[PDB]
Ligand binder design. Structure first.
Ligand SMILES: C/C=C(/C)CC/C=C(\C)CC/C=C(\C)CCC=C(C)C
Ligand SMILES: [Ca+2]
Ligand SMILES: [Zn+2]
Lengths: 316, 325
C-alpha cells in the first residue's frame, strides 16, 4: 500500500466494515462452489469491488455470471445487464481510476459487444485525462478504443496538441506523439519537414516552461531522429544553430537549469563535434557543478564523446 | 520539483533487528492483512525473501507455507494468491520463488506449472496473466522467470516472446505494459529482467535507458518511477535493479539514495514505508532492504537483480543470467 499517512471509532468503523466484507466474500465463494451464477453474485461483488477493485477473483466471478446469464436470458435482458455493468464500471473508476482490474473488465466487456459506442468511450477517456493527464491506464484504454474504432493517427495527433498547449504534465502526451508520428509517414527516423515542425513545437514548450522535463526528453529524441550529421540541410543547420543560441539565452535567465546545459552539449554534437570540442568540454564542467548527482553519467558521456572525436580526427 | 524533504531526525542507521521482528510478527491477527488476501502468495514471498536476505529465514514457518502453496495449485497447473482464489501468473511466479528459496520445488506439480505458463502465450508472443486475457509485459517477465527457475525456458516460443517485448521499447529507451505504452520503472524492471533471462541485453540502449533511469533520482536522494512524480522507496528496487542489469548502477548517487532509504524506516515499529512518515508494509520492507543490498550494504546478503532473491539461492539452482555489467 502507498500514501498511507501515519498518525477508537476510526478503529471501530473498519472493524464493522471487515465483518461485512468478510461475510459478503464468504457468501460469494459459497455461491460459486454451489454453481449459483446469478444476480445475487453481482449484488455481493459490487459491494466489495467498490472499495477493493484489486480483488481480481471477484471480477472473474462477475464475468462468469455475465457469461452464464447471457445464455439463459433474452437479448433485451442481456442488453440491460451490459448497460448496468457499464454504469457500475464508471462508478468504480470514479473512486479508483488506477486499478488494472477495473480497466480490464471494461475492455473485456466492450470487446464482447456488437455494437459498442466507441465515440462515447473516447469521451470517457478525455474526461479522465482532464482529471489526471498522466494516468497511464487511461491512455492505454484510449489506444485500445482508438484501434477498435479505427481512429486515424492524424486525429489522435490533433488531440495531443490541445493537451500539450492547455497545460503542463505533458510526458504522457509527448510519448503518444512519438508513437503517432512514425505511423503518419511511416517506413519499413522522421522525414525532415515533420522533424522541423516537431522541433518548433518542442522548443515553444521548453521556453514557455523551462522546468518542463518532458519537452527536453522528447527534444533529445528528435535530435537523434534525423538524417544525420553531416547531410545537414541548410535549413536544419540554421534551425539547430538558432536553438543553440536560444539555449544560451535561457542559460542566462536560468543558471541552475541543467536541461538547457545538457541540450547545448547535444546540439554542438549534432552540429560539429570537433569544431565545438573546446566549448563542449567547458559545458561539461558547468553542468557537473549544476547537477552533481549526475556526475558519473556526465563523465561517461564525455568519455564517449571524446572517443568519437578521436575516431573523427583519425579519419583525416 | 515534486519531492519530499527529509527531516534531520530521520533514521540514519540500519535497523535489521527491528525489521526481522516486524516481518516475523506480520499477519498475527486485522484490517489491511485481510483486505490484501488477494495477493497473499506474493505477500508471503516478500516476507520470506527479506528474512532470507537478513539471515533470518529460520524464524518463518516452512512446513506451514509448503502446505499452503500446494493447496493453492489449481487443476490447470496455475497457482492462486490464496485458497479459493483464482490462479494467475503473478502468484505462480511467487510460489515458485518461495519453493526455490526452500529447495522444495517437488511440493507442486512442475509439469503442470509449465503447461499453464505455456498456455498463456499469445500468437504475437505476449503473455496473458490468466484465462481472462489481460496482456502486460509484467506477465512476460513472470512467465520466463518462472520457467528459468524450473529449468524449462525451452517450453515457450522465446523468439516471439522477445519480439513482443522489444515492440514495447519507447523513444526514451524504456518500456511500458504493452505496445505504445509510456515508459515506467516497474515495466522497465520486468522487461530488462526478461531480456537478461533470454540473453538479449544487447538489444537495449543502455546509455539512453540508463540516463532515463538515473534521472529518476530526486534532490532528496529518493527515486521516482517516471518523470514528475514523488519518490518511493520501492523504486530503490525497480530503478536500481534495472540499472544493475544494464551495467549502469554507478549512474546513481549511492550515498544520497542510501540516506533516503534509511529515512523510510519506522524506528518504533520496524519496517519501511514508501516515503518518510507513511505507514510501513512488507512490500516496501523487501524493496528497501533489497535496494540497500544492491548498493553494497554489508549486513545483507547479495541479491540477484533479476530474480529478487539471494544470489546464493540462484547459485544453488545454477540460474544466473549474464548482465551487461
Ligand atoms: C505503480 C507503482 C509501483 C511501485 C509498482 C511498480 C512496479 C511494477 C508495475 C512491476 C511489478 C513487477 C512484477 C509483478 C514482477 C515481479 C516482481 C519481482 C520478482 C520483484
Ligand atoms: Ca522456522
Ligand atoms: Zn512503492
Amino acid at each position: 500500500m502507498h500514501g498511507r499517512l501515519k498518525v477508537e471509532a476510526k478503529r471501530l468503523e473498519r472493524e464493522q466494515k471487515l465483518k461485512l466484507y468478510q461475510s459478503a466474500t464468504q457468501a460469494v465463494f459459497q455461491k460459486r462452489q454451489a454453481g449459483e451464477l446469478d444476480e445475487s453474485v453481482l449484488e455481493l461483488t459490487s459491494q466489495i469491488l467498490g472499495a477493493n477493485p484489486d480483488f481480481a477473483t471477484l471480477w472473474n466471478c462477475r464475468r462468469e455470471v455475465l457469461q452464464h446469464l447471457e445464455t439463459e436470458k433474452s437479448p433485451e435482458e442481456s442488453a440491460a445487464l451490459v448497460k448496468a455493468e457499464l454504469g457500475f464500471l464508471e462508478s468504480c473508476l470514479r473512486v479508483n481510476p488506477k486499478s488494472y482490474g477495473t480497466w480490464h473488465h471494461r475492455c473485456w466487456l466492450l470487446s464482447r459487444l456488437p455494437e459498442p459506442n466507441w465515440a462515447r468511450e473516447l469521451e470517457l477517456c478525455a474526461r479522465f485525462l482532464e482529471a489526471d493527464e498522466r494516468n497511464f491506464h487511461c491512455w492505454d484504454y484510449r489506444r485500445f478504443v482508438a484501434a477498435q474504432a479505427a481512429v486515424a493517427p492524424a486525429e489522435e495527433l490533433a488531440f495531443t496538441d490541445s493537451l500539450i498547449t492547455r497545460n503542463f504534465s505533458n510526458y504522457s502526451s509527448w510519448h503518444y506523439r512519438s508513437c503517432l508520428l512514425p505511423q503518419l509517414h511511416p517506413q519499413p527516423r522522421l522525414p525532415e519537414n515533420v522533424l522541423l515542425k516537431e522541433l518548433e513545437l518542442v522548443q515553444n514548450a521548453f521556453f514557455t516552461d523551462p522546468n518542463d522535463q518532458s519537452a527536453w526528453f522528447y527534444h533529445r529524441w528528435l535530435l537523434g531522429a534525423g538524417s544525420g550529421r553531416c547531410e545537414l540541410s541548410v535549413e536544419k543547420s540554421t534551425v539547430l544553430q538558432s536553438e543553440l543560441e536560444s539555449c544560451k539565452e535561457l542559460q542566462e535567465l536560468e543558471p541552475e537549469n541543467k536541461w538547457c546545459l545538457l541540450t547545448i552539449i547535444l546540439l554542438m554534437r549534432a552540429l560539429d563535434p570537433l569544431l565545438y570540442e573546446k566549448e563542449t568540454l567547458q559545458y561539461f564542467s558547468t553542468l557537473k557543478a549544476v547537477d552533481p548527482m549526475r556526475a558519473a553519467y556526465l563523465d561517461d558521456l564525455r568519455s564517449k564523446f571524446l572517443l568519437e572525436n578521436s575516431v573523427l580526427k583519425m579519419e583525416y | 520539483q515534486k519531492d519530499v524533504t527529509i527531516k534531520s531526525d530521520a533514521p540514519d542507521t540500519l535497523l535489521l533487528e527491528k525489521h526481522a521482528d516486524y516481518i516475523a510478527s506480520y499477519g498475527s491477527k486485522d484490517y489491511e492483512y485481510c483486505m490484501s488476501e488477494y495477493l497473499r502468495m506474493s505477500g508471503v514471498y516478500w516476507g520470506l525473501t527479506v528474512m532470507d536476505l537478513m539471515g533470518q529465514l529460520h524464524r518463518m514457518n516452512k512446513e506451514e507455507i509448503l502446505v499452503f502453496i500446494k493447496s493453492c495449485q489449481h487443476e490447470c497447473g496455475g497457482v492462486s494468491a490464496s485458497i479459493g482464489h483464482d490462479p494467475h501468473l503473478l502468484y505462480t511466479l511467487s510460489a515458485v520463488q518461495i519453493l526455490t528459496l526452500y529447495d522444495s520445488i517437488h511440493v507442486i506439480n512442475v509439469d503442470k506449472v509449465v503447461a499453464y505458463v505455456q498456455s498463456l502465450q499469445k500468437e504475437d508472443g505476449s503473455f496473458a496473466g490468466d484465462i481472462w486475457g489481460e496482456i502486460d509485459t509484467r506477465f512476460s517477465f513472470c512467465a520466463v522467470a518462472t520457467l528459468a527457475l524450473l529449468g524449462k525456458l525451452d517450453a515457450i516460443n522465446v523468439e516471439k516472446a522477445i519480439e513482443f517485448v522489444l515492440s514495447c521499447m519507447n523513444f526514451d529507451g524504456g518500456f511500458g505494459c504493452r505496445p505504445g505504452s509510456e515508459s515506467h520503472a516497474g515495466q522497465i524492471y520486468c522487461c530488462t529482467g526478461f531480456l537478461a533471462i533470454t540473453s538479449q541485453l544487447h538489444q537495449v540502449n543502455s546509455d539512453l535507458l540508463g540516463w532515463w533511469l538515473c534521472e529518476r533520482q530526486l534532490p532528496s536522494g529518493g527515486l521516482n518511477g517516471r518523470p514528475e512524480k514523488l519518490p518511493d522507496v520501492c523504486y530503490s528496487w525497480w530503478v536500481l535493479a534495472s540499472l544493475k542489469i544494464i551495467g549502469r548502477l554507478h549512474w546513481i548517487d549511492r550515498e544520497k539514495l542510501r540516506s533516503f532509504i534509511l529515512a523510510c524506516q519506522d524506528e518504533e515499529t520496524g519496517g519501511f514505508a514508501d516515503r518518510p512518515g507513511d505507514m510501513v508494509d512488507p512490500f516496501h520492507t523487501l524493496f528497501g532492504i533489497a535496494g540497500l543490498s544492491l548498493l553494497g550494504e554489508e549486513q545483507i546478503k547479495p541479491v540477484s537483480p533479476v530474480f529478487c532473491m539471494p544470489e546464493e539461492v540462484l547459485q544453488r539452482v545454477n540460474v544466473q543470467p549474464e548482465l551487461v555489467s
